Amino acid sequence: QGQWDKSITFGVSEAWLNKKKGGEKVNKEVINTFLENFKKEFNKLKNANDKTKNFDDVDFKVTPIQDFTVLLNNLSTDNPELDFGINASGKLVEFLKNNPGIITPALETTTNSFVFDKEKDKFYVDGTDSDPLVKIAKEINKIFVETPYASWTDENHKWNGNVYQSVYDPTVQANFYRGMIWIKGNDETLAKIKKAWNDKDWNTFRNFGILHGKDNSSSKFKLEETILKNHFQNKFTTLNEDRSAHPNAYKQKSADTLGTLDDFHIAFSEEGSFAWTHNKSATKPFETKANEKMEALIVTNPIPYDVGVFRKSVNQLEQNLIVQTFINLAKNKQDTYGPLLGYNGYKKIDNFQKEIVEVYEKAIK
Ligand SMILES: Cc1ncc(C[n+]2csc(CCOP(=O)(O)OP(=O)(O)O)c2C)c(N)n1
Ligand SMILES: [Ca+2]
Ligand SMILES: [Cl-]
Numbered sequence: 001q002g003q004w005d006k007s008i009t010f011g012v013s014e015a016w017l018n019k020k021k022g023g024e025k026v027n028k029e030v031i032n033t034f035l036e037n038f039k040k041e042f043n044k045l046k047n048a049n050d051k052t053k054n055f056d057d058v059d060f061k062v063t064p065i066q067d068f069t070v071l072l073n074n075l076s077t078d079n080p081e082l083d084f085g086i087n088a089s090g091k092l093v094e095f096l097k098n099n100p101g102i103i104t105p106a107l108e109t110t111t112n113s114f115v116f117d118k119e120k121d122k123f124y125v126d127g128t129d130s131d132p133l134v135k136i137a138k139e140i141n142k143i144f145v146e147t148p149y150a151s152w153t154d155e156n157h158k159w160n161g162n163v164y165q166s167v168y169d170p171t172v173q174a175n176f177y178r179g180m181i182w183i184k185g186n187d188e189t190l191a192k193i194k195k196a197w198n199d200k201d202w203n204t205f206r207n208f209g210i211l212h213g214k215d216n217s218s219s220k221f222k223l224e225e226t227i228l229k230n231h232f233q234n235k236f237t238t239l240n241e242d243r244s245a246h247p248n249a250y251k252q253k254s255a256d257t258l259g260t261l262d263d264f265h266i267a268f269s270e271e272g273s274f275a276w277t278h279n280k281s282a283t284k285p286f287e288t289k290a291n292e293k294m295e296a297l298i299v300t301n302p303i304p305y306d307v308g309v310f311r312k313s314v315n316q317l318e319q320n321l322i323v324q325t326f327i328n329l330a331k332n333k334q335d336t337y338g339p340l341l342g343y344n345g346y347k348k349i350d351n352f353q354k355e356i357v358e359v360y361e362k363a364i365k
Helices: 026-048 068-076 089-098 132-146 187-198 202-207 218-231 239-245 255-260 316-331 352-364
Strands: 007-013 059-065 084-087 103-114 168-174 179-185 210-212 250-252 266-270 293-299 307-311 345-348
Touching: 007 068, 026 059, 026 316, 059 068, 068 084, 068 089, 068 103, 068 307, 084 089, 089 103, 089 218, 089 307, 089 352, 103 316, 103 352, 132 293, 179 187, 179 218, 179 255, 187 202, 187 293, 210 218, 210 255, 218 239, 218 266, 218 352, 255 266, 307 316, 316 345
Parallel strands: 007 059, 007 084, 210 250, 210 266
Antiparallel strands: 084 307, 103 168, 103 307, 103 345, 179 266, 179 293
8 A cells, every 4th residue: 555654745846945935935835835834734634533643743845857858757767756746737638648657646736726717617719709718818918908918007907916806706716727819919910810820820820930849748739739729620740740841930929029039020928927927027028119019819628637646655545634634724815825826725536537637638639
């Protein structure tokens, strides 16, 4: 059933942990009270239960990790110095396809729903104006274009240091997230792009210039690739092959810089990424030339939110207490770390294949 481990180490993003807010390291103070709250609730549950109270009390710590490849690789070695971490779901499903059973997924995060995307079960249909993913994109434009983002204020949109709270409905927890496709130009260019989209003219559409993230990203590459393949039926095989033949039509850069590239007019991003991007930042995110606008074209199919995974030999009883400690901390509003990453709630995973793998595979098909 695995070994009881009296020391539990959470892997966290190195870049996040050393985050200096005025030379200070706030996140480090944030994670220590989280850890202190976690230890006390965990050991309370453990000692309250007859099956686990005779095991040693457990101490919790964190360790900084470079990136998610080191997290998954490190966990798969099943070394007690690193026991648990939370990873994007698509990347994890891809890892476990290669090397099945090597690590153990156990909990699912949830995030406050966007006011414009409260229902999971909207999928691509045909990319026309009655397509449910196009309808969500129109709702996003009402929020981001009609009431222009550049003029939002911290008080207007309830900025809390973390996110713009006015674009969220915390009463509804979303089981999922989506990517989205942005388009940018003056009036004539926007119309030309929508025409190429409606005419399913791939070559013209792609030649407007596509900004994308890394090849292994779900929400900045793969989910969009799926929509494009389904909309422009049989016109290219994969975005990587297409790029190979048309390298100047593609650039790896964040969508919020799209306004600064005169040569590019299409960009991939996570849905609603402006919601956690302060419009007053030095980089001037989402800014565009005077007579140009940036707007949403369509969003993607949905995939699960991030997943917490264990090295394989942590005792099963211990795993379940840790899972329930995350859930109760969030309920008691004692989770000071999660909300900073977008994790506003937690759920136990009862069936990985049904709840995570199948949901992801249907979205990229
Ligand atoms: C406060 C806050 N809310 C939400 C986010 C966004 N977010 C957190 S976890 C997650 C899901 C996994 O996304 P990502 O790690 O970018 O993996 P990818 O889609 O690139 O594979 C997202 C979109 C954030 N960075 N900050
Ligand atoms: Ca350990
Ligand atoms: Cl119990």
